[PDB]
Design an enzyme around this catalytic site. Sequence first.
Site, PDB file in Angstrom:
ATOM      1  N   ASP A  19      51.720 -11.331  35.309  1.00  0.00           N
ATOM      2  CA  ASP A  19      52.336 -12.250  34.839  1.00  0.00           C
ATOM      3  C   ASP A  19      52.989 -12.121  33.327  1.00  0.00           C
ATOM      4  OD1 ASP A  19      49.820 -11.989  34.294  1.00  0.00           O
ATOM      5  OD2 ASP A  19      48.992 -13.697  35.006  1.00  0.00           O
ATOM      6  N   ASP A  53      44.025   7.997  24.836  1.00  0.00           N
ATOM      7  CA  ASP A  53      42.665   7.827  23.826  1.00  0.00           C
ATOM      8  C   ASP A  53      42.413   6.129  24.581  1.00  0.00           C
ATOM      9  OD1 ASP A  53      41.556   9.793  22.295  1.00  0.00           O
ATOM     10  OD2 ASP A  53      43.492  10.036  21.813  1.00  0.00           O
ATOM     11  N   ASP A  65      31.337  -7.174  31.619  1.00  0.00           N
ATOM     12  CA  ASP A  65      31.644  -8.144  30.921  1.00  0.00           C
ATOM     13  C   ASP A  65      30.561  -9.452  31.035  1.00  0.00           C
ATOM     14  OD1 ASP A  65      33.988  -6.849  31.787  1.00  0.00           O
ATOM     15  OD2 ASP A  65      34.954  -7.824  29.975  1.00  0.00           O
ATOM     16  N   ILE A  75      36.988 -16.059  26.180  1.00  0.00           N
ATOM     17  CA  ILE A  75      37.047 -14.710  25.683  1.00  0.00           C
ATOM     18  C   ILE A  75      38.674 -14.374  25.895  1.00  0.00           C
ATOM     19  CG2 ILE A  75      34.658 -14.190  26.386  1.00  0.00           C
ATOM     20  CD1 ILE A  75      37.322 -12.052  27.729  1.00  0.00           C
ATOM     21  N   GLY A  85      38.251   9.073  29.201  1.00  0.00           N
ATOM     22  CA  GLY A  85      38.849   8.713  30.345  1.00  0.00           C
ATOM     23  C   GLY A  85      38.713   7.132  30.039  1.00  0.00           C
ATOM     24  N   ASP A  89      39.027   2.468  26.426  1.00  0.00           N
ATOM     25  CA  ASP A  89      39.842   1.515  27.111  1.00  0.00           C
ATOM     26  C   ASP A  89      39.294   0.085  27.261  1.00  0.00           C
ATOM     27  OD1 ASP A  89      40.210   4.186  27.815  1.00  0.00           O
ATOM     28  OD2 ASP A  89      40.157   3.658  29.973  1.00  0.00           O
ATOM     29  N   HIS A  91      39.445  -4.386  28.370  1.00  0.00           N
ATOM     30  CA  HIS A  91      39.907  -5.082  29.776  1.00  0.00           C
ATOM     31  C   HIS A  91      40.142  -6.504  29.267  1.00  0.00           C
ATOM     32  CE1 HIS A  91      37.216  -7.870  32.171  1.00  0.00           C
ATOM     33  NE2 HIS A  91      38.269  -8.324  32.418  1.00  0.00           N
ATOM     34  N   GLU A  94      42.817 -11.076  32.966  1.00  0.00           N
ATOM     35  CA  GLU A  94      44.089 -11.434  33.438  1.00  0.00           C
ATOM     36  C   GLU A  94      44.189 -12.609  34.160  1.00  0.00           C
ATOM     37  OE1 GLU A  94      47.240  -9.789  32.283  1.00  0.00           O
ATOM     38  OE2 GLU A  94      46.995 -12.009  33.062  1.00  0.00           O
ATOM     39  N   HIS A 113      42.549  -7.210  17.991  1.00  0.00           N
ATOM     40  CA  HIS A 113      40.901  -7.023  18.153  1.00  0.00           C
ATOM     41  C   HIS A 113      40.569  -5.699  18.993  1.00  0.00           C
ATOM     42  CE1 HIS A 113      36.999  -9.365  18.626  1.00  0.00           C
ATOM     43  NE2 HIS A 113      36.919  -8.100  18.524  1.00  0.00           N
ATOM     44  N   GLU A 114      41.041  -5.600  20.141  1.00  0.00           N
ATOM     45  CA  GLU A 114      41.012  -4.563  21.262  1.00  0.00           C
ATOM     46  C   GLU A 114      41.300  -3.295  20.662  1.00  0.00           C
ATOM     47  OE1 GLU A 114      39.241  -5.200  23.904  1.00  0.00           O
ATOM     48  OE2 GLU A 114      39.412  -7.317  22.789  1.00  0.00           O
ATOM     49  N   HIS A 117      38.495  -2.396  18.110  1.00  0.00           N
ATOM     50  CA  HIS A 117      37.277  -1.888  18.633  1.00  0.00           C
ATOM     51  C   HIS A 117      37.489  -0.414  18.932  1.00  0.00           C
ATOM     52  CE1 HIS A 117      34.083  -4.544  19.505  1.00  0.00           C
ATOM     53  NE2 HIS A 117      35.162  -5.854  19.565  1.00  0.00           N
ATOM     54  N   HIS A 123      32.290  -4.490  12.803  1.00  0.00           N
ATOM     55  CA  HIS A 123      32.831  -5.893  12.262  1.00  0.00           C
ATOM     56  C   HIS A 123      32.346  -6.450  11.028  1.00  0.00           C
ATOM     57  CE1 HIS A 123      34.155  -5.253  16.238  1.00  0.00           C
ATOM     58  NE2 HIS A 123      34.094  -6.520  16.772  1.00  0.00           N
TER      59      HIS A 123
HETATM   60  C1  LIG Z   1      28.987 -10.119  21.811  1.00  0.00           C
HETATM   61  C2  LIG Z   1      30.229 -10.259  22.843  1.00  0.00           C
HETATM   62  C3  LIG Z   1      31.603 -10.739  22.232  1.00  0.00           C
HETATM   63  C4  LIG Z   1      32.296 -11.790  23.069  1.00  0.00           C
HETATM   64  C5  LIG Z   1      33.365 -12.413  22.236  1.00  0.00           C
HETATM   65  C6  LIG Z   1      34.783 -12.809  23.017  1.00  0.00           C
HETATM   66  C7  LIG Z   1      35.469 -11.447  23.025  1.00  0.00           C
HETATM   67  C8  LIG Z   1      35.382 -10.153  22.226  1.00  0.00           C
HETATM   68  C9  LIG Z   1      35.903  -9.413  22.070  1.00  0.00           C
HETATM   69  O1  LIG Z   1      37.331  -9.303  21.925  1.00  0.00           O
HETATM   70  O2  LIG Z   1      35.550  -8.257  22.224  1.00  0.00           O
HETATM   71  C10 LIG Z   1      37.092 -11.707  23.097  1.00  0.00           C
HETATM   72  O3  LIG Z   1      37.765 -11.668  24.075  1.00  0.00           O
HETATM   73  C11 LIG Z   1      37.671 -12.136  21.679  1.00  0.00           C
HETATM   74  C12 LIG Z   1      36.949 -12.584  20.620  1.00  0.00           C
HETATM   75  C13 LIG Z   1      37.656 -12.969  19.465  1.00  0.00           C
HETATM   76  C14 LIG Z   1      38.991 -12.905  19.353  1.00  0.00           C
HETATM   77  C15 LIG Z   1      39.437 -13.256  18.002  1.00  0.00           C
HETATM   78  C16 LIG Z   1      40.219 -13.622  17.156  1.00  0.00           C
HETATM   79  C17 LIG Z   1      40.685 -14.088  15.670  1.00  0.00           C
HETATM   80  C18 LIG Z   1      40.575 -15.446  15.353  1.00  0.00           C
HETATM   81  C19 LIG Z   1      41.144 -15.773  14.141  1.00  0.00           C
HETATM   82  C20 LIG Z   1      41.866 -14.867  13.378  1.00  0.00           C
HETATM   83 CL1  LIG Z   1      42.595 -15.536  11.808  1.00  0.00          CL
HETATM   84  C21 LIG Z   1      41.909 -13.448  13.842  1.00  0.00           C
HETATM   85  C22 LIG Z   1      41.226 -13.048  14.940  1.00  0.00           C
HETATM   86  C23 LIG Z   1      39.571 -12.405  20.259  1.00  0.00           C
HETATM   87  C24 LIG Z   1      39.231 -12.029  21.535  1.00  0.00           C
HETATM   88 CA   LIG Z   2      47.299 -13.811  33.826  1.00  0.00          CA
HETATM   89 CA   LIG Z   3      39.877 -15.244  28.552  1.00  0.00          CA
HETATM   90 CA   LIG Z   4      40.060   5.915  27.171  1.00  0.00          CA
HETATM   91 ZN   LIG Z   5      35.613  -6.126  31.176  1.00  0.00          ZN
HETATM   92 ZN   LIG Z   6      35.132  -7.494  18.348  1.00  0.00          ZN
END
Ligand SMILES: CCCCCC[C@H](CC(=O)O)C(=O)c1ccc(C#Cc2ccc(Cl)cc2)cc1
Ligand SMILES: [Ca+2]
Ligand SMILES: [Ca+2]
Ligand SMILES: [Ca+2]
Ligand SMILES: [Zn+2]
Ligand SMILES: [Zn+2]
Length: 158
Positions: A19, A53, A65, A75, A85, A89, A91, A94, A113-114, A117, A123
């Site tokens: 998508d 990487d 997850d 999330i 490998g 990475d 996920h 989707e 964020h991804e 990490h 953090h």
């Molecule tokens: C302890 C497990 C954490 C799960 C929380 C949800 C997951 C975390 C991750 O990405 O690894 C997620 O998909 C996610 C969480 C937070 C954010 C964000 C943001 C954000 C909000 C405001 C501002 Cl100004 C900047 C960033 C994105 C994805």
């Molecule tokens: Ca989708």
């Molecule tokens: Ca989601």
């Molecule tokens: Ca990798």
């Molecule tokens: Zn996952």
């Molecule tokens: Zn995080």
Amino acid sequence: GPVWRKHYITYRINNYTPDMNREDVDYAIRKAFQVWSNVTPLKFSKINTGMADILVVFARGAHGDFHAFDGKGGILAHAFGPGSGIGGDAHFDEDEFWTTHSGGTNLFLTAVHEIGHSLGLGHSSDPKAVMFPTYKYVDINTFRLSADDIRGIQSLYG
Ligand SMILES: CCCCCC[C@H](CC(=O)O)C(=O)c1ccc(C#Cc2ccc(Cl)cc2)cc1
Ligand SMILES: [Ca+2]
Ligand SMILES: [Ca+2]
Ligand SMILES: [Ca+2]
Ligand SMILES: [Zn+2]
Ligand SMILES: [Zn+2]
């Protein structure tokens, strides 16, 4: 073989999602890369042939997850630590409905964020740092990074 690098990192984008628009993913991922690179001593580089990487893949809660989180909001995605490998990475749920530019969740937010990490350190634990678990939909228009935060990561190993 012998892996031990600390400057040049590789990256790979999945099938541009079924998508999610490909051009959109590239733009969002490109901007996030500059923000992470321009604030880090380690440059990054995307490819589409050999191993990389930081690998970005789109999947729905299942392979983990926490027993498949959501698939319609909540999330956005997650990434593992170093290794090889699979390791490094991430996920993205989707299944859910992603919105490019506007309409909900942006790829840029999740991309930053991804990415952090994989490369970015720990953090902050505080409702402000672009990494904290707490999710809050925020168009990139306000996606700003504390100077101290970015300065700390770059000053550490850079
Ligand atoms: C302890 C497990 C954490 C799960 C929380 C949800 C997951 C975390 C991750 O990405 O690894 C997620 O998909 C996610 C969480 C937070 C954010 C964000 C943001 C954000 C909000 C405001 C501002 Cl100004 C900047 C960033 C994105 C994805
Ligand atoms: Ca989708
Ligand atoms: Ca989601
Ligand atoms: Ca990798
Ligand atoms: Zn996952
Ligand atoms: Zn995080």
